[PDB]
Write a protein that binds this DNA or RNA. Structure first.
Length: 98
DNA sequence: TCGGCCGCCCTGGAGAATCCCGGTGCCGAGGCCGCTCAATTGGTCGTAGACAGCTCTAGCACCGCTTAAACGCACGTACGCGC
């Protein structure tokens, strides 16, 4: 999109609200109750953008393409700390691949 | 990204003009009257036209050549028409 404003301008900066409230909702250190998070974005973002997000969320994104399980070209970055979230995509008979 | 601009259908609402409907008034048309002159009737002549007869002119019909032109097909570019 030629008119794009990046990550710190326009509607790009709306992620930081989520980042804040996620941090506020996260248990404090020493409180070992289970807690999990998942954030999504488009693969086609700026390299400096992706880097800044990777620095802020203290993780590298997993790239997952929808087409393997969802028959759509929607390649998306997924930040999060779900266990075993690196594992390859499996297909289920219920899901539609065509 | 993403919010602000031109057809399309659908629809009808103000709105200036027009049709319909009454109310009034007037002057032009329908009807009555005298009268007088043009339509009618009767008769008579005179010739325009109806009709018989003849004739003889041209109009229709036919036929055979003879090319002059009408027809038919290709074709291509100039003009009719839509935008």
């Amino acid at each position: 999109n030629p008119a794009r404003k990046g990550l710190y301008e326009g509607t790009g900066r709306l992620f930081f609200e989520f980042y804040r409230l996620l941090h506020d909702a996260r248990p404090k250190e020493g409180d070992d109750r289970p807690f999990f998070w998942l954030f999504e974005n488009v693969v086609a973002m700026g390299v400096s953008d992706k880097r800044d997000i990777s620095r802020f969320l203290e993780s590298n994104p997993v790239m997952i393409d929808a087409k393997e399980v969802s028959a759509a070209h929607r390649a998306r970055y997924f930040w999060g700390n779900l266990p075993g979230m690196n594992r390859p995509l499996a297909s289920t008979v219920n899901d539609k691949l065509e």
